[PDB]
């Protein structure tokens, strides 16, 4: 059932966006309700629809085919059919008094006889061609002859009637009226490409023949809305819209002795059951014929060998399903099959294909069942729900072509062997799909090459620790052997091998000139054959992407027999880690290539030189030899350096340099290179301005167990600093030169300036980690302000923490997104805290002043966390929380508090005189009066205590007070409230006498009228509500 609205979507697509006319809307309708009613079916309908859209857009689909071998694309169509841009198109103005055929003979003639795009080959092709011919002709391309016979059209009747010698008159005085040809040729020309348009109309017209039936399918797919196809230079109709009438005939085998013979065509023979009894059966012959040959053998029972008598002949593709195991050997009885494909549900498989047959062993729910092949051409083996089943390949017989294996195991028990032998290349493709608690361990693989194997791959699922959320994995051992790897004269044929990710794995093939390593690994050992020729071609490539070692890589053959010379790795679209390279034989190293290839540690004696090339960069862990000369490239290289005797250059990009001992050796030098470049001191004390041996770098940083005590930082525009064996002093330290701490030091870290002598001396101090950060001791003697940024690397929240010693610092200010508690002990000339800038949900700053100045303007200002601000009892403060749930301290003088958004709490820990008191400026319900610290004789009331002292309309603030304090307060202090000049005060009685004495009882002011009524009191804690 099509609503109307359905069939006119139909209908503008397939007309490329025009609408229908009023009179045409009428007809879809009944097309309709006749489907609403049952009187039409829905495929009925719709065909219809399409149908009327003929004239309009088929005119151009197959004209277009025949004319220039290719369907316009749809974008051509829409300027063909209906478009803005085209003033006259098909559906449009111009065209409006044409009929059916006369378009199909307008467009003809345009793509065939004129500048049209077919003008060459069509005039190339039909030339000196009669006109009988012609139209016999192309009735066969178009309307099919075979076809149109059976259809029962008679080919004769019709061919003759269009080349009879009225209609060619017709036509001659046509073109000669219409087009602009006067030549005798041209109009000859033109008159064949007149009847090969009427050809076509009469074929779309009763829906017989090639093109008619194609053409329909377009406009089907065209019709929802988008084509499927759609090649940017036009579609070929026959290629995508395929026919294929024909499928041959399909034959039944019975429980008894079938005789059966194929049409020499695309024919099917099913082997079922019947009463659950299996229909192939004793003395049954099969026979194909042409070659789309297919038998389908099903069984519930297994699968156990050919029945006697049988024999399967002609039958290019055999495909056999048991609901049990499967037993079969097709070397023998049957002849001519091209494909083998087995298929088993939770049980065995054992099956041996002859050559030039393609294996298929499919097998679902393994479980403990194994999989076992042999013999074939290209096999595949293709098994899911594994565990305890091995898999096992070309154990008895090899296969001719390439093998294919790939397990999969959800289980937690771990998933069996796998073995290849023999073939040209061998894949061998394990997954594990185990749950997010529980490991699954992987299988151990063995490949061992015949002599036509060139290349083996190995992957597995990546080795993970199981986790609350992440599934567990460890890899299984990989063996590949070539065949003439024992030998001592046999060539031996493994090339290349591919790992994605592995347990303890081997190769050992004398012909191996490429590893390709993937994922995650723990060991590989690769030796050589035992080829007792001095070898020539000596070059591992060992390619790289995304590898991680638990251990080594090693050449196992350099120690007692002849290894690699030059080792080549191409790091590969993401970083790779080998944790140990050893390669005893090993002269030259290249590492090249897209993204970071590390070594954490070679083992490399003979080296005589190492090259990076590769653009992210390289870095090796381990401490070159004093004789090893290594040569960077563009992107940050990164090395460790003894006394060196060679030229070591870095190359361009932001390189670092570690050395063990601060000079050189016989000469012996290390140059930077362009770009930033660290310098990084692993030793005693340094002075590397004064070295010419050094050259080229920007940055110094002292890190390293044997990192400590004085170090030059002049001629230097930044510093560094690390983990370190003690105490570290860094002197004459230029004007903008900052320090970041990267890990937590060792001892005191003194900064000592350039120049420290003026007034206006600016340090910039960065805290730089992914966790918290215990920077330690830093002094900066003689700076006036100092900056700390702390610095959070990772997306969770941290707090670092530092002692600052800068004795003639006026200024601290704070920025960065992690927290700070600074120790800041002796830091007396400080009257500016501003940690304003600081940002995240808890990067919390506690901050103390030291500050002794009697009188003194201090200002202290929190930042977005929860911050702990003390001032100084000597001072005036004005402190200032940001977000969050700060704690500002009282200690004695006229503060000032501002507690900004957030729950904060005023902490009050001095009394006060009744001129020097806190003033509260924003208190709001959230906040918290913590009163503890002046609970002189016992503690705080305890309840809800809320109702405002009141006094006379000319009260001053002294009368407020001794009214306020009035009660006795020698036992037991206690809090009471009022409001003055519209202001709120809040007072702690501890006196005998109604005299508010300034020594012992307290006073807080809070700006505003704030109503403390319903407000209640914690331990001594009062919640404002
Ligand atoms: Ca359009
Ligand atoms: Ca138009
Ligand atoms: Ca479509
Ligand atoms: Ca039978
Ligand atoms: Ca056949
Ligand atoms: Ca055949
Ligand atoms: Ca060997
Ligand atoms: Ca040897
Ligand atoms: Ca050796
Ligand atoms: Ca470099
Ligand atoms: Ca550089
Ligand atoms: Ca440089
Ligand atoms: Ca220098
Ligand atoms: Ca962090
Ligand atoms: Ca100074
Ligand atoms: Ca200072
Ligand atoms: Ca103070
Ligand atoms: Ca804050
Ligand atoms: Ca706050
Ligand atoms: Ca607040
Ligand atoms: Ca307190
Ligand atoms: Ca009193």
Do not use: C
């Not at 020309?189 to 090639?210: D, E, F, H, P, Q």
């Not at 090993?586 to 005589?608: E, F, Y």
């Not at 001794?962 to 009660?967: F, K, L, M, V, W």
């Not at 809070?1006 to 403390?1012: F, H, K, R």
């Amino acid at each position: 059932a099509y609503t109307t609205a359905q069939l006119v979507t139909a209908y503008t697509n397939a007309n490329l966006g025009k609408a229908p006319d009023a009179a045409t809307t009428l007809t879809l309708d009944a097309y309709a309700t006749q489907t609403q009613t049952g009187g039409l079916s829905d495929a009925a309908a719709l065909t219809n629809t399409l149908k009327l859209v003929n004239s309009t857009t088929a005119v151009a689909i197959q004209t277009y085919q025949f004319f220039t071998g290719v369907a316009p694309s749809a974008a051509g169509l829409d300027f063909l059919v209906d478009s803005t841009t085209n003033t006259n198109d098909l559906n449009d103005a111009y065209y409006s008094k044409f009929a059916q055929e006369n378009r199909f003979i307008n467009f003809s003639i345009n793509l065939a006889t004129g500048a049209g795009a077919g003008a060459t080959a069509f005039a190339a092709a039909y030339t000196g061609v009669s006109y009988a011919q012609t139209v016999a002709t192309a009735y066969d391309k178009i309307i099919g002859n075979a076809v149109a016979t059976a259809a029962g059209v008679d080919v004769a009747a019709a061919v003759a009637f269009l080349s009879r010698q009225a209609n060619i008159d017709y036509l001659t005085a046509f073109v000669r009226a219409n087009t602009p040809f006067t030549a005798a040729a041209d109009i000859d020309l033109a008159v064949k490409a007149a009847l090969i348009g009427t050809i076509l109309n009469a074929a779309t017209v009763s829906g017989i023949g090639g093109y008619a039936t194609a053409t329909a399918a377009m406009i089907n797919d065209l019709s929802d809305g988008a084509l499927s196809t759609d090649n940017a230079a036009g579609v070929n109709l026959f290629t995508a819209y395929p026919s294929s009438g024909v499928s041959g005939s399909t034959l039944s085998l019975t429980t008894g002795t079938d005789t059966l013979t194929g049409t020499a065509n695309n024919d099917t023979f099913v082997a079922g059951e019947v009463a659950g009894a299996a229909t192939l059966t004793v003395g049954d012959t099969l026979s194909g014929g042409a070659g789309t040959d297919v038998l389908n053998w099903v069984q519930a029972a297994a699968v156990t060998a050919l029945p006697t008598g049988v024999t399967i002949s002609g039958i290019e593709t055999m495909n056999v399903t048991s609901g049990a195991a499967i037993t079969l050997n097709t070397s023998s009885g049957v002849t001519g099959l091209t494909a083998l494909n087995t298929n088993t549900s939770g049980a065995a498989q054992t099956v041996t294909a002859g050559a030039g047959q393609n294996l298929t062993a499919t097998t679902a729910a393994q479980a403990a069942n194994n999989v076992a092949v042999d013999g074939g051409a290209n096999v595949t083996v293709a098994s899911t729900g594994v565990t305890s089943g091995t898999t096992t390949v070309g154990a008895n017989s090899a296969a001719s072509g390439t093998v294919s294996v790939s397990v999969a195991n959800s289980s937690t028990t771990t998933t069996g062997a796998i073995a290849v032998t023999g073939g040209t290349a061998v894949t061998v493709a394990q997954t594990a799909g185990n749950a997010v608690n529980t490991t699954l361990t992987q299988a151990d693989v063995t490949v061992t090459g015949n002599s036509s194997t060139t290349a083996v791959t190995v992957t597995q699922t990546a080795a993970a620790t199981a986790g609350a959320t992440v599934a567990g994995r460890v890899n299984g051992a990989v063996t590949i052997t070539d065949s003439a790897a024992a030998s001592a004269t046999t060539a031996g044929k493994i090339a290349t091998v591919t790992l994605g990710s592995f347990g303890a794995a081997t190769i050992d093939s004398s012909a191996l000139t490429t590893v390709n390593l993937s994922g995650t690994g723990t060991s590989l050992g690769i030796g050589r054959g035992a080829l007792t020729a001095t070898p020539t071609a000596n070059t591992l490539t060992l390619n790289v992407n995304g590898l991680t070692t638990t251990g080594a890589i090693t050449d196992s053959e350099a120690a007692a027999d002849d290894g690699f010379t030059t080792i080549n790795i191409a790091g590969s679209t993401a970083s790779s880690t080998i944790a140990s390279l050893v390669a005893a034989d090993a002269t030259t190293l290249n590492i090249s290539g897209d993204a970071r290839v590390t070594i954490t540690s070679h083992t490399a004696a003979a080296l005589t030189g190492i090259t990076v090339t590769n653009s992210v960069g390289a870095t090796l862990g381990a401490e070159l030899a004093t004789g090893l000369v290594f040569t960077g490239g563009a992107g940050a290289d990164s090395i460790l350096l003894g006394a060196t005797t060679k030229a070591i250059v870095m190359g361009a990009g932001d390189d670092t340099v570690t050395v063990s001992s601060a000079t050189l050796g016989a000469g012996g030098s290390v140059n930077g290179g362009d770009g930033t470049d660290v310098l990084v001191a692993n030793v005693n004390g340094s002075s590397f301005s004064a070295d010419p041996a050094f050259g080229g770098f920007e940055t110094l940083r002292v890190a390293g167990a044997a990192a400590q005590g004085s170090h030059n930082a002049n001629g230097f525009t930044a510093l560094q600093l690390g983990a370190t064996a003690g105490a570290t002093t860094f002197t004459n330290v230029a004007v903008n030169v900052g320090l970041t701490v990267l890990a937590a030091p060792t001892g005191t870290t003194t900064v000592t300036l350039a120049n420290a002598t003026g007034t206006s001396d600016v340090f910039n101090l960065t805290l730089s980690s992914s966790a918290a950060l215990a920077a330690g001791t830093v002094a900066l003697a003689g700076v006036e302000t100092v900056n700390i940024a702390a610095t959070d690397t990772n997306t969770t929240a941290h707090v670092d923490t530092l002692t600052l010693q800068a004795t003639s610092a006026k200024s601290i200010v704070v920025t960065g997104n992690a927290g700070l508690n600074l120790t800041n002990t002796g830091n007396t000339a400080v009257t500016s805290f501003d940690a304003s800038a600081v940002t995240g949900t808890g990067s919390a700053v506690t901050f103390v002043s030291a500050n002794t100045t009697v009188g003194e303007v201090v200002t202290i200002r929190g930042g977005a966390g929860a911050d702990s601000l003390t001032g100084s009892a000597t001072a005036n403060d004005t402190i200032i929380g940001g977000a969050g749930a700060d704690t500002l301290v009282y200690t004695g003088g006229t503060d000032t508090f501002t507690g900004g958004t957030g729950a904060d709490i005023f902490d009050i820990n001095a009394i006060g005189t009744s001129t020097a008191f806190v003033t509260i400026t924003d208190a709001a319900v959230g906040d918290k009066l913590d009163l503890v610290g002046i609970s002189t004789n016992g503690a705080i009331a305890d309840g809800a205590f809320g109702a405002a002292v009141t006094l006379g309309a000319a009260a001053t603030l002294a009368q407020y007070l001794d009214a306020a304090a009035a009660g006795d307060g020698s036992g037991t202090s206690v809090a009471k409230w009022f409001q003055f000049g519209g202001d709120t005060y809040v007072v702690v009685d501890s006196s005998a006498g109604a005299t508010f004495v300034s020594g012992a009882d307290a006073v807080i002011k809070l700006t505003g009228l704030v109503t403390l009524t319903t407000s209640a009191f914690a331990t001594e804690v009062l919640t404002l509500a």
